[PDB]
């Protein structure tokens, strides 16, 4: 066994360098050349809040078993991840580093690293994927506390202590650092925003939400406090080993790349646990645009498995957003259902109400919902109110003044305001008006395979051609493109 | 006186349609004095029975060269739509109108008492005069081009009857200035303002909205009242110091009183079951502007007044006058400080940090500096400015940094033409350091000949470019602490 600084990086990395004048982005979908230039223990900026920096961290904490899973990872990046953990973490807290080699072409990549202090290497003899691999590694883990990391991460100053502090106090807490950004092209370590929560849209795709000004303001008191998050990114978190096992580990039937973060996030919250982002904890991660290793299927499959088990009726809203997904077979979900029963978990409705209330949820009787799309353009109130005109604006999925509903009352409403046919004459501007169910002028029907909006009891169609000349108009229905409108969710 | 329906409107109204009033007079004149209008109320209000032991009100209506048809129509709407026993009197304050007959003639009408001003006093002074003359326990103020709706008054009176410190407003429906159509307003609105102290309508937060879903016609707390149209306990009005008597003609009215009420232990409400139509217009039939506004700001706002001046620097120059009594008044009343107001009443108002050098939007012509919803390691750009300040909300810090939230404009690469990036703010990062130059019209990267430049916006995003006379290098913050 060898101490990390005595490890010969030049020799390790050198075998596998980018050659000739070949493409440095080819193997990994990040700049390998730039990564390889980097010292195994390279210096990085302290991206922490000042308050964290002025803090004595307890060290009387349970040790962790770091689980790192990988498949044909760039040697320099992999090594760097491992050394960052060793160098930046109080040793007594680092029980072991468990390297799970997920059927890498070259077994030496991982095997060689096995020489290193506290590094244990586990090699899959077939491709299992991220979820299954993690479980294997977790299973092999000796410590009380589990830490999961990606294979192209860089740990920052006193990254571990704050995380451990949390789960030590309360073993149902599942915690994450703030995930700094490591640039995929030049490998610059960039400090991320701390003002972010995890989140999602009805298509169940992960996204970063900004905190509400309400929330932000209420923290001003303590700005480095834990942040409740309805969802975790997934790559990087810390979890009590026993708790992990108890709650049902990971869904074992999921595949290569999910999806898993979705499922676990729901499961933890619903079954009495909590999810935290921890600002004083900083870990760099190489974000990329594409995977190096069907994708839309596997994603849909896993996503389905999660939705079907946890979401209850609200699953439909998913299918509304992504109808193609109804067709994707997902498989057997029996144990998972039993698991939920057994754990005495809360229903999804509870989750939405208490955990993710800012998630905009359609009325149960709404016909259609969300944004009203016309190409890359969206239907937009333009910040107008009553007696106000209406328009178009490039779509932005921030759904605010772009948030619309097609009601059971056949009405096209934003907030308590309604698209109103004030004047039946073609070319006539429509108006925003207070919704009245009795009002026939406010009545709209979807036509031509839910691709248009016809004014009920007429040959008139919602039309954007007049947008630049005053606003959305009512025009005689015809095969024009300006009459094309699609809601993002349909039921 | 004479019964309103016996009043001869045809005769009264008898002596370019937009010229005199900045609304369509012809269209207004076509209208019957008691014309029918749609019931714009929530269903729940419709289905509701009212007290009877309610205090009567003294309706105060103030006017200056108002359109006869509109004026009459306001008055008859009050009479026709209000239970008579609740209408003590209608007080018409003629604010030095060219033709005194306009008002005088209306004096024939049941419960109508006309007060003329023998010189132009303005809206604020006139109201006080009227209030002073008022016999009832409760004061009601209205504009001279309003139309009262079904059971408008009872819900207002109900409130101030229960609690005399409540100052209440109806939802103000919209009367179209061109065609005179009565249009139902949004009930999802609160009163508000920006640091330029200009009144504006805020939407309720989804948080708020949701929490009302239980009772959707409940009173709505508002940090600010539109001003034209409200109901107030007469004694309370007097106690709290009426109106500021040295204010003049033009606005600022809503402003001062709104602060005063809240700060001095009272409350402001919008009342959804109460509906009153108002003729909104684009223009008046500019410094008083600043004057009055100043008087309010200087008295109530404490240090935060500076933020106003920052938004409107030209206002520093405008003389406002003597504010002694008003200050004494505030002392006497044992009023809370403005900080309290902001924290407790108007917290959604975005308030700069105390050390911040500049604040708000970063303007380049009609375009604004915008994050494009990008986060860290993200590029940055321009977007047509929208005063909804979100991804257009910026600050120039004491640390010489140009920050949005906890993100910072970062000079990643000093080479001219180089794209800048959004990065987590570090005080010890030199690459993040910016200075204002050329009379606060540009942004120079500290320790360089490099200037923040938008010419590359369409080709990748905002860049760092060699400082020069180009228009793409022009940037102005909406608030400056200078």
């Amino acid at each position: 066994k060898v101490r990390w600084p005595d490890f010969n990086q030049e020799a390790y990395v050198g075998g596998t360098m980018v050659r000739s004048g070949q493409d440095p982005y080819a193997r990994n979908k990040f700049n390998q050349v730039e990564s390889d230039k980097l010292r195994m223990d390279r210096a990085i900026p302290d991206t922490r809040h000042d308050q964290c920096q002025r803090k004595q961290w307890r060290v009387d904490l349970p040790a962790t078993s770091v689980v790192i899973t990988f498949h044909n990872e760039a040697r320099s990046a992999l090594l760097r991840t491992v050394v960052s953990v060793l160098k930046k973490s109080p040793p007594h807290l680092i029980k072991e580093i468990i390297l799970v080699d997920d059927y890498s072409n070259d077994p030496e990549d991982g095997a060689l690293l096995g020489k290193i202090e506290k590094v244990r290497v586990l090699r899959n003899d077939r491709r299992e994927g991220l979820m299954r691999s993690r479980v294997r590694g977790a299973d092999a883990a000796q410590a009380k506390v589990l830490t999961f990391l990606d294979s192209h991460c860089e740990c920052n100053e006193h990254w571990l202590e704050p995380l451990l502090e949390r789960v030590a106090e309360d073993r149902t807490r599942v915690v994450s650092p703030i995930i700094d950004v490591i640039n995929m092209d030049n490998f610059q370590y960039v400090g991320a925003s701390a003002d972010l929560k995890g989140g999602f849209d009805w298509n169940l795709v992960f996204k970063w939400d900004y905190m509400t000004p309400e929330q932000r303001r209420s923290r001003q008191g303590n700005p480095v406090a834990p942040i409740k998050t309805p969802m975790i990114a997934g790559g990087l978190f810390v979890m009590d080993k026993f708790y992990f096992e108890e709650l049902g580990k990971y869904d074992m039937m999921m595949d290569v790349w999910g999806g898993e973060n979705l499922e676990i996030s729901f499961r933890v919250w619903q079954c009495g646990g909590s999810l935290e982002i921890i600002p004083c904890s900083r870990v760099g991660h190489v974000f990329r645009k594409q995977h190096p290793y069907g994708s839309g299927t596997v994603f849909a499959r896993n996503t389905r498995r999660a939705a079907e088990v946890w979401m209850d009726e609200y699953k439909n809203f998913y299918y509304a957003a992504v109808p193609s997904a109804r067709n994707v077979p997902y498989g057997n979900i029996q144990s998972r259902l039993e698991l939920r029963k057994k754990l005495s978990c809360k229903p999804f409705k509870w989750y939405l109400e208490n955990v993710y209330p800012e998630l905009r949820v359609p009325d149960h009787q709404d016909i259609a919902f969300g944004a009203l799309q016309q190409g890359t353009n969206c239907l937009d109130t333009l910040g107008h109110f009553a007696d106000g005109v209406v328009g178009v604006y490039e779509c932005h999925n921030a759904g605010g003044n772009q948030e619309w509903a097609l009601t059971k009352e056949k009405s096209v409403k934003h907030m308590d305001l309604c698209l109103t046919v004030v004047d039946r004459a073609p070319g006539s501007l429509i108006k925003l008006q207070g919704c009245r169910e009795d009002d026939s002028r406010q009545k709209w029907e979807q036509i031509e395979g839910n691709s248009k909006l016809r004014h009920v009891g007429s040959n008139l169609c919602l039309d954007s051609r007049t947008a630049k000349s005053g606003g959305l108009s009512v025009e005689v229905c015809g095969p024009a493109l300006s009459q094309q409108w699609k809601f993002t969710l349909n039921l | 006186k004479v019964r309103w329906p016996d009043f001869n409107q045809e005769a009264y109204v008898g002596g370019d349609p937009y010229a005199r009033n900045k609304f369509n007079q012809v269209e207004s004149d076509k209208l019957r004095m008691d014309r029918a209008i749609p019931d714009t109320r929530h269903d729940q209000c419709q289905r509701k029975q009212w007290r009877v032991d309610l205090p009567a009100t003294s309706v105060v209506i103030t006017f200056h060269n108002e359109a006869r048809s509109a004026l009459l129509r306001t008055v008859v709407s009050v009479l026709k739509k209000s239970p008579p026993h609740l209408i003590k009197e209608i007080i018409l304050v003629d604010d030095y109108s060219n033709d005194p007959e306009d008002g005088a003639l209306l004096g024939k009408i049941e419960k109508v008492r006309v007060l003329r001003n023998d010189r132009r006093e303005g809206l604020m002074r006139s109201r006080v005069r009227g209030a002073d003359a008022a016999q009832a326990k409760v004061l009601t103020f209205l504009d001279s081009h309003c139309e009262c709706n079904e059971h408008w008054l009872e819900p207002l009176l109900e409130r101030v009857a229960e609690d005399r410190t409540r100052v209440v407003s109806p939802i103000i429906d919209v009367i179209n200035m061109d065609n005179f159509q009565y249009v139902g307003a949004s009930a999802d609105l609160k009163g508000g303002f920006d640091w330029n102290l200009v009144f504006k309508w805020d939407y309720m937060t989804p948080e708020q909205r949701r929490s009302r879903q239980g009772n959707p016609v409940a009173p709505i707390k508002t940090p600010m009242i539109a001003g034209g149209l409200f109901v107030m306990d007469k004694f309370y009005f007097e106690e709290l110091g009426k109106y500021d008597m040295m204010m003049d003609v033009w606005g600022g009215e809503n402003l001062e009183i709104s602060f005063r009420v809240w700060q001095c232990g009272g409350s402001l409400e919008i009342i959804p079951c109460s509906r009153v139509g108002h003729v909104f217009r684009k223009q008046h039939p500019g410094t008083v502007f600043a004057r009055n506004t100043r008087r309010a700001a200087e008295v109530w706002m404490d240090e935060y007044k500076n933020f106003y001046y920052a938004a409107v620097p030209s206002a520093r120059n405008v003389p406002y006058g003597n504010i002694q009594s008003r200050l004494e008044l505030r002392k006497k009343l044992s009023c809370k400080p403005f900080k309290w107001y902001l924290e407790n009443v108007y917290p959604e108002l975005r308030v700069p940090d105390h050390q911040d050098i500049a604040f708000g939007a970063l303007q380049q012509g009609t375009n604004c500096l915008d994050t494009l919803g990008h986060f860290a390691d993200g590029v940055v750009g321009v977007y047509e400015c929208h005063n909804a300040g979100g991804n257009q909300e910026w600050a120039l810090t004491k640390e010489k940094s140009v920050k949005h939230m906890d993100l910072c404009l970062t000079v990643v690469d000093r080479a001219p033409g180089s794209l800048i990036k959004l990065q987590g703010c570090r005080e010890d990062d030199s690459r993040q350091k910016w200075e204002q130059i050329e009379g606060n019209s540009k942004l120079r990267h500290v320790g360089s000949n490099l200037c923040l430049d938008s010419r590359t916006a369409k080709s990748g995003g905002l860049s760092v470019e060699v400082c020069g006379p180009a228009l793409s290098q022009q940037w102005k913050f909406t608030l400056n602490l200078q």
């Binding site: 950004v181 991320a192 974000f287 645009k289 | 986060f375």
Partner: peptide, 5 residues
């Protein structure tokens, strides 16, 4: 891919 902070 996961999306960047």
């Amino acid at each position: 891919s996961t999306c960047p902070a």
